[PDB]
RNA sequence: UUUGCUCCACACAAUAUAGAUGGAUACGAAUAAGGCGUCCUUGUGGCGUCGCUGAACCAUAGCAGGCUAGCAACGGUGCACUUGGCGGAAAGGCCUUGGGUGCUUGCUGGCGAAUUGCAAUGUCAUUUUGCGUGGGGAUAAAUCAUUUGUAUACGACUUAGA
RNA sequence: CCCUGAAAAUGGAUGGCGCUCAAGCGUGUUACCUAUACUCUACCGUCAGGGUUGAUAUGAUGCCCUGACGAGUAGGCAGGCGUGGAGGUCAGUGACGAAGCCUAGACCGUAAGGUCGGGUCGAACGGCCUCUAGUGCAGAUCUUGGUGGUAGUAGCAAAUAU
RNA sequence: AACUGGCGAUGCGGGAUGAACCGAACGUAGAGUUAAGGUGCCGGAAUACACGCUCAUCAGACACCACAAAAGGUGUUAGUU
RNA sequence: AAUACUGCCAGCUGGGACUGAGGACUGCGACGUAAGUCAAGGAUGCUGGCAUAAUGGUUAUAUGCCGCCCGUCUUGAAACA
RNA sequence: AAUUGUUGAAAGGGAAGGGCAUUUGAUCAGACAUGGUGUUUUGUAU
């Protein structure tokens, strides 16, 4: 009878999208990233910084 | 009283009087559409009267309902009032104007006997 | 056209007894509670805090 | 406002019930409406729609 | 759109079986965001080479941030524009803190003085003046003086109420 | 004391209006010394009473009152939109409404 | 914040004072504008005189007696300027113009009450130094105001009458500040100050 | 002209509201300068300080503001009285002598508050009359009508008449 | 940019007031104001697609569900309100008061209109189903009748004269 | 005359005002968000911020639109050789 | 290394406004071993005052804003048609 | 009915009339004050 809104009203947000509970539990939207010591090429950064 | 009903709202309580009905006396108050080619009432100019529209139609569940929540019913004789024996919560009695005083006392007596609310009980009171 | 219960009063007495005993230690608080509150002029309740 | 792609409030352009006043024709329509509503067979869906046809659209067979 | 960002936009012709890996042109564009960066890149590249966005592609768009974004530095900006009855070129010295702020001030001052909108201003080149003794504009040489000092007379204080009960002074 | 004001005064400025059309349903109120929307955000939901004097006693008081609430802020000057059970009479443009501190939030 | 305010008209620009006064009048404030002689109009004096003459020669042709009444007093000049800024024709505008009272110089009882200035309508805070200005005192005498000299003498007397008032107020303020210092550095003020005052 | 008129007092009713709900809290002049305090070899002076907001200063506690007791003292603040004054720009208000009186939260006590029940402005202001209770004060004019003409269509004007 | 070039006749128009580190010009940053626009909701109507009959609903052009739309002259169609008269029915109303008429009194309908109360009046008149038409007025320099402003006005001043 | 959109037949917000322009088309209401246009006051909305230019002894102020040219000015601000 | 900018969260939470549509249940789902509970196919719970001109209706008036005199011919009417 | 008088009400700074909303005055209907979760009929339907 009434269009309840997902993205709020967790009951509806779980009725649709059952993955929502796992998403909220394991924080899939706020997932920490790893670290890589990758450095951009000196040639590329020279092109960017030149002139 | 009646059965429970939704809140009553007219959605336009003000009457829709005809244009120029006060500027002229010959123009009766009864609504007539202004059907002229120049008329600002037809062209719906801001600041002029609003013509009746279907958008003002009252709620179906509260149509013909008096503020007391009953649909009116012109009763003329006692036999007519015997029609509403079990519908006291829906239709409210109402004595017709042409019912004589001596015939109104019997009808109001039968009205209180049958338990039907009457909306003109102080009409043509004999004193 | 138109007295207080004799049961309310002693409860009031025994409760404000404890409240008074607690409040006597801290300075100025009893007459602070006696004083009524009001808004002066030159006051800004949207930033005044209580 | 909406760009009316085609005419709005365009009626079906078909007959829902016979324009006739025949009570027995109204009874036949009352029956075949029940049949066309409650039976998958399209034979009811076609006989019911043919019961509304006018005199020229119901030639003698 | 005047809050600027420098972007380097690198782009090239569409690679072809006949000639692959086109020359991969590049330029520095002052723009409000990456979209205006793309647009200005193609505009300044149509005015230079036979290439259009249909016949070309954008290989990169990298925001350029200053090496010392908080160090005052003099800019010589060669700029052309389209005046009402013809075009012009000139060279404006600006004394700002970043190329972004320099081009911001430059468009703002061009619109203020020569009534030239963005649609008719092309920055030919913003070159940091490497050292002094060569800037040729008195309105900058006056700020290149030793012991740069000047006061600020007649300070106007913005008020909070419509009514003031003190006849405000203006010392500063 | 000699000051029993438990409300903050307010000038009922005008109806919510366009250049040439006003909406009587919504009134515009100005609080003294409130000139920024974040400051006027506190006054939202507060009760406003327009307390006016009638020529006669009606229900045991010569002083009648129209109740209302602060709906939302308005402009950058701390003016707030207000709404009443019955709209203001349009004669009170510049009259003193009272904005009480209830429903309190702090 | 104030029941009725008395606006000093000295050092104010006509239009920028009149706008804020017209807003405050409609908002239900009561304003009395004094010292309308020194009210300033930005720009050249001769240009202002020519503008006034442009306005002045503009009257109802068929009957001058009903045309735009070209007032010459500085108070009525400022009041005409404030009209037009107020929808004077309607009743609310009439009420606001009743709530307005403009006075040449400082008549009583506003002579013994605190005058106020509008900070952002001021000549000091609104005219870039160097731009010359026009003052209603000389403009009105150039256009027909035949009372500057007597206003001059009345203000000459009011300055001394208020000067002795301040002369004694300064002495009393000095003695009360000295008594404040005398009673200071006691506990009641010392821990009051750290308490907030 | 049912003892008329008016003013001071009190009450009672209305009607009356362009809008009370602590205090309009008073130099002037400049703003590329000023205010305040001190000082002096008094001036367009020296020194110091301040501003950068009124977010201030005053006031502000008490049954909507009771009753009552004491402590420290010669204050504050109403209310009137009075000494004098000063103020004409729309003065009608400001200062001040003195005494009486009420309150005093400057400090410490005690008693009371309730049931308007969980809010309903919870009324308190400023105007104007009109009947009244009781003191003072004075004891007319105008218009018509008649008449003159310095006036005049009529008005008006200008007259005169106990 | 500004200035000169730059002169039209009632007074006068950036809309006015006014505006000078603008309330002007150029440009940009945000914030904010408000259309009958857009979103959501309620309601009305139309349209479209549907649900609804094994002892279950007043028994269906009905009820209900869903969704979308709604500007509009000329014009078309549909549903209705109202007047005069006819057939039927309510064994309708009425001299204890029909019709008619007045009613800044009430209710219903979006509306056409209907109904009720009060006052006059005194003899016929209603609802529904259907039929029928000399069937609905604000205009036609409309017709007939009546009544106003103009207006207690113009005028009742040739013929000598009472 | 050609293409298209509108007015006619159309209200509504803005253009002070206007059949045609800008926005946007309309059942009755509520709440929010906006469009065009604006935000000193009239007038709802920042006498907000920022950079400059201009002083006019007829300033200028916003498209349609309600006015202006050639030429000239060690007036002033930028600039080119 | 931070912080700024942009972006993401099926992150939490504070305050405000308007609306409460429908009326046996079903359905989708969440939590709870389960029973059952529930923010899950639309508002209930408690409390208060009044019970009448208080709310409301009508009408008159004032105020704020708006509102040009209707019919017609006309591309265009408030027209000095 | 136009139109007029009297009375009563109100309003009136070069019109009047109208719309939206409210104030104010005047006036007007409605509730729920329900056979009511019953509680001995004074020789058992209040």
Swiss-Prot record, chain C:
Processing and modification events after translation: N-terminally acetylated by acetyltransferase NatA.
Subcellular location: Cytoplasm
Function recorded in the entry: Component of the ribosome, a large ribonucleoprotein complex responsible for the synthesis of proteins in the cell. The small ribosomal subunit (SSU) binds messenger RNAs (mRNAs) and translates the encoded message by selecting cognate aminoacyl-transfer RNA (tRNA) molecules. The large subunit (LSU) contains the ribosomal catalytic site termed the peptidyl transferase center (PTC), which catalyzes the formation of peptide bonds, thereby polymerizing the amino acids delivered by tRNAs into a polypeptide chain.
Family named by the database record: Belongs to the eukaryotic ribosomal protein eL6 family.
Complex and partners: Component of the large ribosomal subunit (LSU). Mature yeast ribosomes consist of a small (40S) and a large (60S) subunit. The 40S small subunit contains 1 molecule of ribosomal RNA (18S rRNA) and 33 different proteins (encoded by 57 genes). The large 60S subunit contains 3 rRNA molecules (25S, 5.8S and 5S rRNA) and 46 different proteins (encoded by 81 genes).
Other remarks in the entry: Present with 37100 molecules/cell in log phase SD medium. There are 2 genes for eL6 in yeast.
Name of the protein in its database record: Large ribosomal subunit protein eL6A
Species the sequence originates in: Saccharomyces cerevisiae (strain ATCC 204508 / S288c) (Baker's yeast)
Gene: RPL6A
From Swiss-Prot, chain D:
Primary role: Component of the ribosome, a large ribonucleoprotein complex responsible for the synthesis of proteins in the cell. The small ribosomal subunit (SSU) binds messenger RNAs (mRNAs) and translates the encoded message by selecting cognate aminoacyl-transfer RNA (tRNA) molecules. The large subunit (LSU) contains the ribosomal catalytic site termed the peptidyl transferase center (PTC), which catalyzes the formation of peptide bonds, thereby polymerizing the amino acids delivered by tRNAs into a polypeptide chain.
Subcellular localization, as worded in the UniProt entry: Cytoplasm
Protein family (similarity comment): Belongs to the eukaryotic ribosomal protein eL18 family.
Species: Saccharomyces cerevisiae (strain ATCC 204508 / S288c)
Quaternary context: Component of the large ribosomal subunit (LSU). Mature yeast ribosomes consist of a small (40S) and a large (60S) subunit. The 40S small subunit contains 1 molecule of ribosomal RNA (18S rRNA) and 33 different proteins (encoded by 57 genes). The large 60S subunit contains 3 rRNA molecules (25S, 5.8S and 5S rRNA) and 46 different proteins (encoded by 81 genes). eL18 interacts with NAP1.
Highest taxon in the source lineage: Eukaryota
N6,N6,N6-trimethyllysine modification, residue list: 49
From-to range in the entire protein, with total length: 2 to 62 of 186
Name assigned to this protein: Large ribosomal subunit protein eL18A
Miscellaneous section: There are 2 genes for eL18 in yeast.
UniProtKB/Swiss-Prot annotation, chain F:
Chain positions with N-acetylalanine modification: 1
Alphabetical list of Pfam families matching this protein: Ribosomal_L35Ae
Example GO biological process: cytoplasmic translation
Keyword Cytoplasm assigned: yes
Gene3D superfamilies attached to this UniProt entry: translation elongation factor selb, chain A, domain 4
Subcellular location: Cytoplasm
GO cellular component, one term: cytosol
Assembly notes: Component of the large ribosomal subunit (LSU). Mature yeast ribosomes consist of a small (40S) and a large (60S) subunit. The 40S small subunit contains 1 molecule of ribosomal RNA (18S rRNA) and 33 different proteins (encoded by 57 genes). The large 60S subunit contains 3 rRNA molecules (25S, 5.8S and 5S rRNA) and 46 different proteins (encoded by 81 genes).
Family to which the UniProt record says this protein belongs: Belongs to the eukaryotic ribosomal protein eL33 family.
Role this protein plays: Component of the ribosome, a large ribonucleoprotein complex responsible for the synthesis of proteins in the cell. The small ribosomal subunit (SSU) binds messenger RNAs (mRNAs) and translates the encoded message by selecting cognate aminoacyl-transfer RNA (tRNA) molecules. The large subunit (LSU) contains the ribosomal catalytic site termed the peptidyl transferase center (PTC), which catalyzes the formation of peptide bonds, thereby polymerizing the amino acids delivered by tRNAs into a polypeptide chain.
Misc note: There are 2 genes for eL33 in yeast.
PANTHER family linked to this entry: 60S RIBOSOMAL PROTEIN L35A (PTHR10902)
Name this polypeptide is given: Large ribosomal subunit protein eL33A
Biological classification of the source: Eukaryota, Fungi, Dikarya, Ascomycota, Saccharomycotina
UniProtKB/Swiss-Prot annotation, chain G:
Protein name (database record): Large ribosomal subunit protein uL13A
Key words of the record: Acetylation, Cytoplasm, Isopeptide bond, Ribonucleoprotein, Ribosomal protein, Ubl conjugation
Entry's Gene Ontology BP terms: cytoplasmic translation; maturation of LSU-rRNA; negative regulation of translation
Naturally occurring in which organism (per UniProt): Saccharomyces cerevisiae (strain ATCC 204508 / S288c) (Baker's yeast)
PROSITE patterns: RIBOSOMAL_L13 (PS00783)
NCBIfam families: L13_A_E
Function description: Component of the ribosome, a large ribonucleoprotein complex responsible for the synthesis of proteins in the cell. The small ribosomal subunit (SSU) binds messenger RNAs (mRNAs) and translates the encoded message by selecting cognate aminoacyl-transfer RNA (tRNA) molecules. The large subunit (LSU) contains the ribosomal catalytic site termed the peptidyl transferase center (PTC), which catalyzes the formation of peptide bonds, thereby polymerizing the amino acids delivered by tRNAs into a polypeptide chain.
Post-translational modification as stated in the protein's UniProt record: N-terminally acetylated by acetyltransferase NatA.
Any single Pfam family the record assigns to this protein: Ribosomal_L13
């Amino acid at each position: 009878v009434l269009k309840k809104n997902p993205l709020k009203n967790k009951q509806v947000l779980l009725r649709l999208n059952p993955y929502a509970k796992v998403f909220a539990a394991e924080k899939l939207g706020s997932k920490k990233a790893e670290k890589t010591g990758t450095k951009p090429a000196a040639v590329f950064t020279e092109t960017l910084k030149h002139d | 009283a009646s059965l429970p009903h939704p809140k009553i709202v007219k959605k336009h309580t003000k009457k829709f009087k005809r244009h120029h009905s006060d500027r002229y006396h010959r123009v009766a108050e009864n609504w007539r559409k202004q059907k002229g080619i120049d008329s600002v009432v037809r062209r719906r100019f801001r600041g002029n009267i609003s013509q009746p529209k279907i958008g003002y139609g009252s709620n179906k569940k509260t149509k013909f309902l008096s503020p007391s929540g009953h649909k009116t019913f012109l009763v003329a004789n006692v036999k007519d009032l015997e029609t509403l024996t079990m519908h006291t919560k829906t239709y409210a009695a109402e004595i017709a104007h042409n019912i004589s005083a001596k015939n109104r006392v019997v009808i109001l007596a039968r009205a209180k006997a049958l338990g039907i609310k009457v909306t003109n009980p102080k009409g043509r009171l004999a004193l | 056209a138109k007295e207080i219960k004799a049961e309310r009063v002693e409860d009031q007495k025994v409760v404000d007894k404890a409240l008074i005993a607690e409040i006597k230690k801290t300075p100025l608080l009893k007459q602070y509670l006696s004083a009524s509150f009001s808004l002066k002029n030159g006051d800004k309740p949207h930033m005044l805090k209580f | 406002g909406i760009d009316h792609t085609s005419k709005q409030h365009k009626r079906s352009g078909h007959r829902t019930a016979p324009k006739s006043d025949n009570v027995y024709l109204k009874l036949l329509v009352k029956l075949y409406t029940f049949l066309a509503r409650r039976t998958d067979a399209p034979f009811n869906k076609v006989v019911l729609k043919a019961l509304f046809l006018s005199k020229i659209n119901r030639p003698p067979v | 759109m005047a809050h600027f960002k420098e972007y380097q936009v690198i782009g090239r012709r569409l690679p072809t079986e006949s000639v692959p890996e086109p020359k991969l042109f590049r330029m520095r564009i002052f723009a409000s965001n990456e979209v205006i960066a793309k647009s200005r890149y193609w505009y300044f590249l149509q005015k230079l080479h036979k290439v259009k966005k249909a016949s070309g592609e954008i290989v990169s768009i990298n925001q350029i941030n200053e090496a010392h974004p908080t160090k005052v530095k003099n800019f010589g900006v060669w700029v052309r524009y389209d005046s009402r009855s013809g075009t012009h070129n000139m060279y404006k010295e600006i004394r700002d803190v970043s190329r972004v702020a320099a081009v911001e001030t430059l468009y703002q001052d061009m619109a203020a003085r020569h009534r030239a909108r963005f649609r008719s201003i092309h920055i030919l080149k913003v070159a940091e003046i490497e050292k002094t003794a060569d800037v040729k504009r008195q309105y900058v040489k006056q700020f290149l003086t030793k012991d740069l000092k000047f006061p600020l007379p007649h300070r106007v204080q913005k008020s909070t109420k419509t009514f003031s009960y003190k006849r405000p002074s203006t010392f500063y | 004391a000699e000051s029993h004001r438990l409300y903050v005064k307010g000038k009922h400025l005008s109806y919510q209006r366009s250049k040439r059309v006003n909406n009587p349903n919504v009134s515009l109120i100005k609080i003294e010394g409130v000139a920024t929307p974040q400051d006027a955000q506190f006054y939202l939901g507060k009760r406003i009473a327009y307390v006016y004097r009638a020529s006669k006693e009606v229900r045991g008081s010569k002083i009648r009152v129209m109740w209302g609430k602060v709906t939302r802020t308005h402009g950058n000057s701390g003016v707030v939109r207000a709404t009443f059970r019955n709209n203001l009479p349009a004669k009170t443009f510049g009259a003193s409404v009272r904005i009480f501190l209830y429903p309190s939030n702090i | 914040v104030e029941p009725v305010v008395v606006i000093d008209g000295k050092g104010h620009l006509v239009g920028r004072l009149a706008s804020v006064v017209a807003k405050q009048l409609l908002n239900g404030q009561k304003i009395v504008v004094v010292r309308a002689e020194e009210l300033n109009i930005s720009g050249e004096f001769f240009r202002n005189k020519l503008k006034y003459h442009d306005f002045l020669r503009k009257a109802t042709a068929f009957n001058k007696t009903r045309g735009p009444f070209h007032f010459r007093a500085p108070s009525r000049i400022f009041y005409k300027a404030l009209r037009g800024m107020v929808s004077h024709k309607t009743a609310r505008g009439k009420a606001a113009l009743e709530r307005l009272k403009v006075f040449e110089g400082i008549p009583p009882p506003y002579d013994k009450k605190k005058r106020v200035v509008v900070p952002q309508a001021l000549r000091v805070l609104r005219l870039k130094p160097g731009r010359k200005y026009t003052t209603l005192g000389k403009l009105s005498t150039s256009v027909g105001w035949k009372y500057e000299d007597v206003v001059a003498k009345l203000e000459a007397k009011r300055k001394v009458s208020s000067a002795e008032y301040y002369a004694k107020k300064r002495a009393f303020t000095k003695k009360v500040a000295s008594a404040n210092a005398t009673a200071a550095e006691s506990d009641v003020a010392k821990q009051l100050a750290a308490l907030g005052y």
